[PDB]
Amino acid sequence: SKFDVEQLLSELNQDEKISLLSAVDFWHTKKIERLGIPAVRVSDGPNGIRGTKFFDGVPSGCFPNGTGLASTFDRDLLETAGKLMAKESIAKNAAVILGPTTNMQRGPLGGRGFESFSEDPYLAGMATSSVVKGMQGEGIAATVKHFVCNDLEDQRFSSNSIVSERALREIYLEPFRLAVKHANPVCIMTAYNKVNGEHCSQSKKLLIDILRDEWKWDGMLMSDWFGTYTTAAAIKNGLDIEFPGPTRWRTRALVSHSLNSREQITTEDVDDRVRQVLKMIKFVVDNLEKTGIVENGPESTSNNTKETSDLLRKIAADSIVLLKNKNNILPLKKEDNIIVIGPNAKAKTSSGGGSASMNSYYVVSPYEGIVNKLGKEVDYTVGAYSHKSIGGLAESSLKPADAENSGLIAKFYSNPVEERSDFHVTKVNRSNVHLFDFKHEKVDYFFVTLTGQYVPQEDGDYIFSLQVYGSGLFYLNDELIIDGTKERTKKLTLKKGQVYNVRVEYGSGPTAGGFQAGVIKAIDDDEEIRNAAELAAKHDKAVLIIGLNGEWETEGYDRENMDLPKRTNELVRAVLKANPNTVIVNQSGTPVEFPWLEDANALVQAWYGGNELGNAIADVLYGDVVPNGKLSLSWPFKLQDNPAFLNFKTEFGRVIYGEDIFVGYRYYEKLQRKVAFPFGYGLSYTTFELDISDFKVTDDKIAISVDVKNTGDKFAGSEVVQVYFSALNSKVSRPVKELKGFEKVHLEPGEKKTVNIDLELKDAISYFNEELGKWHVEAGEYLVSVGTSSDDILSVKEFKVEKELYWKGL
Amino acid sequence: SKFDVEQLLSELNQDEKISLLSAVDFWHTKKIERLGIPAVRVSDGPNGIRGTKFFDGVPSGCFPNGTGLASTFDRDLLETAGKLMAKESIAKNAAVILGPTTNMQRGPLGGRGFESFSEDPYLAGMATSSVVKGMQGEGIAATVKHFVCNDLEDQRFSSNSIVSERALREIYLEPFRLAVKHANPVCIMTAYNKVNGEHCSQSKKLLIDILRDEWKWDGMLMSDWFGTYTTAAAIKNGLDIEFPGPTRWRTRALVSHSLNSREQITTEDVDDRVRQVLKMIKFVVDNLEKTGIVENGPESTSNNTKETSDLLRKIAADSIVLLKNKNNILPLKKEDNIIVIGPNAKAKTSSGGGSASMNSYYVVSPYEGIVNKLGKEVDYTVGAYSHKSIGGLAESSLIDAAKPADAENSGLIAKFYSNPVEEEPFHVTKVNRSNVHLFDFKHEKVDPKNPYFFVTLTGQYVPQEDGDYIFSLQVYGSGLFYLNDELIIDQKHNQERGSFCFGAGTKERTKKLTLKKGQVYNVRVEYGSGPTSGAGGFQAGVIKAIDDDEEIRNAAELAAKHDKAVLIIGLNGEWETEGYDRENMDLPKRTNELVRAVLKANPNTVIVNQSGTPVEFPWLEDANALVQAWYGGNELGNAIADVLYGDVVPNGKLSLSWPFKLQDNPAFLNFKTEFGRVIYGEDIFVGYRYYEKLQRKVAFPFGYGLSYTTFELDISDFKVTDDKIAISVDVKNTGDKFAGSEVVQVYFSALNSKVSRPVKELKGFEKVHLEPGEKKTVNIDLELKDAISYFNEELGKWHVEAGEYLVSVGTSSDDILSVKEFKVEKELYWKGL
């Protein structure tokens, strides 16, 4: 190693020390050439590596979203995914990934519920631990986020999560505990919200008492972006580095003046934070030979290979959960006469919105995956629209027809169209132009002239669209058609083949920024539903693709309800009536109500599948991948059944975690409230059976062997063995049972394997004793329940525990 | 009138509100043109108005220093001083003055002890209050400072004044209480320091619970400069405006992010601070017709007039305190044969150092004063030097030693560059004063957040004597001193920290050279500002080396050959300055040896001492005539003449105890910031309250001063109502030659209190002018609660205790001439004003 933390700490002067406590820009820590300390690049996010730009982003591999990844219940595969994320990161020259995410879906409506793993803390913690192992094994630093209780988006910079120490310990801190214990993440990012009255990013209890004194974790803490709220407290209380730069709270003047005036912090506080930042740079520098990361290096698409594609396709396929399949409707045969219908059928809903999304090398739509599978054109009808806003203009705009004449051209200007006599130019491929992290020499106010030609493909009405932050004007054929803002629309009649001129005059956010101009073919909503029904009736099978998208589920706001959008439900009822052998494929990051569920004979949950989403869906539907995912989340019938129904809004600045330890399936089992599909549920195209085949308990370990067998005679497949524990005679209220182990096993038809699950008792059966402030292994009788979902328990074993244990730590 | 606080507060958007919460620059608040809110200019200081810059500043009227002003014991005159200060402030187009200063000399060694009024809170309060009424009666806003307990300089940004509530109330808050009650200052400035663990500038206790809730004062609080230490707690806890700009703690991002994240503050807190700023603005706006202040106006010398000069001379003459006068050495007569001797005789020591200082119209030295008096040359010898550092170079140099010692050719030329010497200068100035003070230096090419620049200082120096000269260099930043393009002084390599620049810059470095009379020498100083390593500054000096033993000999022998020696000694604005405290109470260098030898040679010597706070006079027993002149401003030397010659009959009384020795003082062991703190161990026993309680004799007691006449007084009426005390005092000038003023001092004592009290406390005073044989009756009226209360720290209230009380009337704290007793039947507890 050429990197010595303590030596450096002893050589840095005070100004240099202060300069290490904030990032330079959105993505980079501070270079100190004098001492051989490089700038380190970080990059979002948990489902693929975006790089240093949103607008004009270098393309990258988008992975399935977190709740889909967790539904694999496959540690090895999750490790493989983190290794591939590392390779994706190296290709962007980012030494640290801002992921994975592991907040908790205590209710279903969280705007970032798609982005984390699981309502279960053991599944969330092992998924986290597995991704981090895979990232860090390649020499790339993980950042587990957001610590802690950032479990909804509403007013997140100020929201006070008010939560008991028992629920804080057992549910919210637990996946971080597990990640730390098993994977040692190099970084953790603090949340935006408060916990019990105190912003996480200056909470000594969280940042120091727990992470440092109790858990002995020696990583680096960074703020979420702008999630610092004081100068001195955050430094005293354990926040190692403020992002993004340029610093707001930690200028040289603010910090040294606090030091020199004996206001709250000491030079020792500052050194403690600089020391953690140096340990993080030490990991990066020690790994440079292995990763090849170039300081301030170029960003490329070099990881866009067949190997990456096939692995993304596998990870997406195994994420998929088969929820219903009556009458052997699935698998489809390639000779089936089918029509594909639905608002998501030709959509590319690769991810949810915001920080975790990106510019992909490509996304295969579900329709394209089915055309690719069948090797021919497939009958289609859209059925219904379900977009939140109109986009699609850049994606369908331009003589030549080239894939390089494709889109719009953006020409940036110093002054307005209203006053220019007669600096940056960019080929725009997506209608949502997101200028937040945009930078140029001639900018801090700037203006944009967005141009191209649009050619309608059908005769009739088209609805043109524009949204801005916060100035623009939309021109078609040099006539003004449309004057953060609401969506404003103009409907106009056009003609197939005819070329129109699109011109958007935009002014920057002070007039950061952003805008979207879109267009869509208008339809008759009633007629298109009748048409899909009529068509579905005339085919053997229909495949109906529905769901939400990255505008309904997005960082920045929570969902208002659990409904499917617009006329989706009406569409589905009409199609099911016209053809009962319709398979429904749903894309969403979190649950949606299916009111017609009783009539749906085949139903597949695909999540948001990333670049290969549509091929993975085709793989499952045709049986080339046998469905093998299980729900990482409870799927209640109705929003009102959920434990957080009444407290999932920031009100008077707070959110009371009223259900306490009873989150997700812990709530439903305790109430005996029936759900549409429970935690851990998923079907296959084959049948399995299992039995505990050996069992052994000591004073400190539990060892379980489980034989699993594929009893079908046609498909090979994987089953997920899930191991739950129950206290049968505790003095303390607990959930009916708790997931503490799982193993995934692949089995040829007729094949049998034995899997082994070994755990310390303290891992299996502790609850957090709030009054004593300690975890407790309580003497008494316990049950281990082994099954293939939280309900489908197939084999059980009773055992006694005589030796008590109180513990803290890992 | 058309300026409506609540209307404007309703119309400002959030960004404009935040912009009002800090100053734009060192001296102005935020213009909000669309609402007709102008930039208000504020200026230092408590003893005259500096204007907008230290370096190259516009000349001004310097008054005598606070301790001098308080020594007049004259409310009318002090109120008249405030009016003249306002007129001065109008000439600089400053609508707000940053003064009076009224921290407390709990010990003698405070760097800014000169700057405040008195160790007695009654005198400190009544002086403050008089000066504020003077200023505000002319429509110029006062800023009483520094609230509170900024009573030494050492580590003042972090210093924790640890003080009981009773002492805090009776001594340190008290002059503020009295100022608010009688004068209603428009503003108050918060101190740099902490009080019982909390920075004054974010102390809810001080800034809200006491200022607002209990006293109901409604002015505006401003921080001392850079003395804000948080974003949200300072806003929540009552600090209305942060100075200087550009804002550190209160950018739109820090404030709006705090608000939007529900960190500490709400919009209501921000509105409460903005409201108070608006009220200060409204005072300035509603007085613009009367004052004629012009927004961002020019700064003039238009008040440099005879009327101003006469007033300053009078104010200075009445501050002087006659301390000893045996054998009628004084008044001096025109036909006395005299020599003037001493380090301060030709000195211009008009003020103490720091933010109270300024560039003067002129200063009349004591020597010049005695010369103006007689209308003829006066014999003189220096006797000894007592400078702390060597300046005097810009003052005695020329730009081109070929052309005459012109206005335009006298001094040095300073060129300012963006890069070091090793391009056209962005700024060029003619320097007259050796101390180049860059703290508020302003320029388009200078980043206020990182004042990075270089100075090339040049000119020519011609010595008027053969011999050794001692050149000198002092910096904050970096500098090289070349003489004839050869390096003579290095202040670039291995700097040591010393006294220069409020104790932040370098120890003085020097160079002894032998020079030839009339020979022309090229002075070149190359200087790098602070960030080169605020802007800071530097001083290049030169002085004539003298043989110390020899000069003492020469002074002694000369004194023997005259009827009378006039020996002028003391300290100056470098020994006594903002930024650091004095190390000891000693007169500097060889002063005391000079004095001893001069007194032995001619016991008919009058010693005149210039200091802001006490010095040990170890030869005292042998000094038969002794005058305390303080620092007397522009007219200091004409005022000293006036008093020496009996054109003004000495009428000052000491505003401070003057103990024999440093170790006698209450704060001997706790006048330093140690582990960030200062424990106020003497509690309420400060100044004369201490010496009297210990029965410890001092060289001169609080309230003491002599006249060239004698006086006698009687209490001729004394009445107590349930509510008020009425005292009449007959004062007679019982001499036959000189008219003069006597200062009647009224003290009270609680005789059987349950609580330890001081032996007695000053609660009233009147100054009365009497022709020989004349008699007058002065009337003193006062409310009981403000005369005999103590603060009951356990109950958290002031307490008029039942029992017997004594009133003492005299002409000093140690010269009581008449007493009366009264009984209080019923106790009262009270809070507020």
Contact call for residues A58 and A300 (beta carbons, < 8 A): yes
CA distance to partner chain B, nearest, from residue A260 (Å):
7
Q: How far is CA B422 from CA B417, B453, B480, B526, in A?
A: 12, 14, 12, 10
A466-495 residues labelled b (16+ CB within 10 A) or e (exposed)? bbbbebbbbbbeeeebbeeeeeebbebebe
Burial (CB count <10 Å: 0-12, 13-18, 19+), residue A769: middle
B74 φ, ψ (degrees, to nearest 5): -125, 95
Domains, chain B, with CATH or none: 1-292+656-701 (3.20.20.300), 306-382+547-646 (3.40.50.1700), 391-544 (2.60.120.260), 710-833 (2.60.40.10)
CA distance to partner chain B, nearest, from residue A257 (Å):
7
| A230 neighbourhood in chain B, CB within 8 Å | 230-232, 263
Which tokens belong to A191?
Answer: 């949340």
| A249 neighbourhood in chain B, CB within 8 Å | 254
Which of B192, B263, B676 has its CB closest to that of A199?
B263
Pick the closest to residue A790 from A725, A730, A732 (CA basis): A725
Q: Could you give the residue numbers annotated as active site of A?
A: 224
- HSE, side-chain direction, 13 A CA sphere, residue B91: 21
B650 prior amide bond cis, ω within 30: no
**Chain A residue nearest residue B202, CA to CA:** A263
CA distance B76 to A619: 100
CA distance A761 to A576: 50
Contact call for residues A587 and A599 (beta carbons, < 8 A): no
CB contact under 8 A, B253 and A248: yes
- DSSP H stretches of helix in B62-152: 66-71, 75-91, 121-137
CA distance A301 to A162: 44
Contact call for residues A277 and A21 (beta carbons, < 8 A): yes
Pick the closest to residue A14 from A180, A257, A226 (CA basis): A257
CA distance B396 to A108: 84
Pick the closest to residue B6 from B365, B339, B274, B401 (CA basis): B274
Pick the closest to residue A153 from A551, A556, A554, A552 (CA basis): A556
Element (H, E) at B747: strand B740-750
Place of tokens 């988006």: A153
- CA torsion, points A349, A351, A357, A360, in degrees to nearest 10? -60
Number of H helices, E strands in chain A: 19, 35
Contact call for residues B470 and B511 (beta carbons, < 8 A): yes
CB contact under 8 A, A158 and B262: yes
Which tokens belong to A218?
Answer: 């020696």
Pick the closest to residue B311 from B80, B561, B567 (CA basis): B80
Which tokens belong to A335?
Answer: 């000779």
Which tokens belong to A677?
Answer: 């599909």
Which of B160, B229, B263 has its CB closest to that of A258?
B229
CB contact under 8 A, B230 and A263: yes
Contact call for residues B338 and B562 (beta carbons, < 8 A): yes
Instruction: Give catalytic status of residue B224 as yes or no.
Output: yes
Contact call for residues A305 and A59 (beta carbons, < 8 A): no
CB contact under 8 A, A248 and B251: yes
Q: Where are the beta strands (DSSP E) in B578-694?
A: 605-610, 625-628, 677-679
DSSP states of A120-176 as a string?
SHHHHHHHHHHHHHHHHHTT-B-EEEEETT----TTTTT-EEE--HHHIIIIISHHH
Which tokens belong to A761?
Answer: 């008792």
CB contact under 8 A, B231 and A226: no
- HSE, side-chain direction, 13 A CA sphere, residue B517: 4
Contact call for residues B728 and B712 (beta carbons, < 8 A): no
In SS3 terms, A477-509 reads as CCEEEECCCCCEEEEEEECCCCCEEEEEEEECC
CB contact under 8 A, A158 and B194: no
Pick the closest to residue B185 from B45, B280, B103 (CA basis): B280
**DSSP state, residue B206:** I
**DSSP state, residue B214:** I
**Chain B residue nearest residue A262, CA to CA:** B158
Give chain A's length: 810
Place of tokens 């007219």: B635
- At CA B349, angle to CA B474 and CA B51, rounded to 5? 80
Which of A199, A232, A254 has its CB closest to that of B248?
A254
| B192 neighbourhood in chain A, CB within 8 Å | 261
Element (H, E) at A671: helix A665-671
Three-class SS of residue A265?
coil
Number of H helices, E strands in chain B: 20, 35
Pick the closest to residue A73 from A566, A777, A789, A794 (CA basis): A789
**Chain A residue nearest residue B258, CA to CA:** A229
A538-560 residues labelled b (16+ CB within 10 A) or e (exposed)? ebebbbbbbbbbbbbbbbebbbe
A131 φ, ψ (degrees, to nearest 5): -55, -50
- At CA A256, angle to CA A254 and CA A261, rounded to 5? 95
Diameter of chain B by CA atoms? Answer: 84
CB contact under 8 A, A253 and B158: no
| B260 neighbourhood in chain A, CB within 8 Å | 157-158
Which tokens belong to B388?
Answer: 């702390």
CB contact under 8 A, B249 and A251: no
Contact call for residues B770 and B712 (beta carbons, < 8 A): no
| B249 neighbourhood in chain A, CB within 8 Å | 254
**Chain B residue nearest residue A231, CA to CA:** B230
CB contact under 8 A, A262 and B158: yes
**Chain B residue nearest residue A232, CA to CA:** B230
CB contact under 8 A, A229 and B263: yes
Give chain B's length: 833
Considering only CB atoms, which residues of chain B are within 8 Å of chain A?
157-158, 160, 192, 194, 199, 226, 229-232, 248-249, 251, 253-254, 257-258, 260-263, 449, 676
CA distance to partner chain B, nearest, from residue A73 (Å):
37
Active-site position among B44, B74, B224, B683: B224
Residue A521: partners with Cβ closer than 8 Å, 6 or more residues away: A456, A458, A460, A461, A462
CA distance A761 to B681: 61
Which tokens belong to A659?
Answer: 């259900």
CA distance to partner chain B, nearest, from residue A194 (Å):
9
**Chain B residue nearest residue A202, CA to CA:** B263
Which tokens belong to A376?
Answer: 């021919």
- At CA A333, angle to CA A330 and CA A337, rounded to 5? 105
B568-600 residues labelled b (16+ CB within 10 A) or e (exposed)? bbbbbbbbbbbbbbbeebebbebbbbbbbbbbe
Which tokens belong to B538?
Answer: 């530097």
Which tokens belong to B736?
Answer: 């036959």
CA distance to partner chain B, nearest, from residue A226 (Å):
9
Which residues on adjacent β-strands are paired with residue B769? Answer: B741
Burial (CB count <10 Å: 0-12, 13-18, 19+), residue B519: exposed
**Chain A residue nearest residue B157, CA to CA:** A261
For this PDB entry, the determination method is X-ray
CB contact under 8 A, B676 and A254: no
Parallel, antiparallel, or unpaired: how do β-strands B220-222 and A143-147 relate?
unpaired
Best A19, A159, A261 member to test B by mutation, with max B CBs in 10 Å, is: A261
CB contact under 8 A, A229 and B258: yes
CB contact under 8 A, B158 and A254: no
Contact call for residues A423 and A432 (beta carbons, < 8 A): no
Which of B231, B254, B676 has its CB closest to that of A262?
B676
DSSP states of B775-832 as a string?
EEEEEEEEEHHHHH-EEETTTTEEEE-SEEEEEEEESSTT-EEEEEEEEE-S-EEE--
CA distance B424 to A695: 89
Contact call for residues B605 and B622 (beta carbons, < 8 A): no
Pick the closest to residue A561 from A598, A601, A596, A588 (CA basis): A588
Diameter of chain A by CA atoms? Answer: 88
Which tokens belong to A447?
Answer: 């203006």
Which of B160, B254, B261 has its CB closest to that of A157?
B261
Burial (CB count <10 Å: 0-12, 13-18, 19+), residue B523: buried
DSSP states of B503-558 as a string?
HTSBPPEEEEEEE-TT--EEEEEEEE-GGG----EEEEEEEE---HHHHHHHHHHH
CB contact under 8 A, A199 and B676: no
CA distance A544 to A567: 14
CB contact under 8 A, B257 and A251: no
A168 φ, ψ (degrees, to nearest 5): -55, -50
CA distance B446 to A558: 49
Count Cβ–Cβ pairs < 8 Å, chain A vs chain B.
Answer: 53
Which of B232, B249, B260 has its CB closest to that of A158?
B260
Pick the closest to residue B314 from B559, B641, B718 (CA basis): B641
CA distance A103 to A191: 10
Pick the closest to residue A165 from A797, A785, A767 (CA basis): A767
CA distance B286 to B353: 35
Residue A133: partners with Cβ closer than 8 Å, 6 or more residues away: A79, A82, A182, A183
Considering only CB atoms, which residues of chain A are within 8 Å of chain B?
157-158, 160, 194, 199, 226, 229-232, 248-249, 251, 253-254, 257-258, 260-263, 653
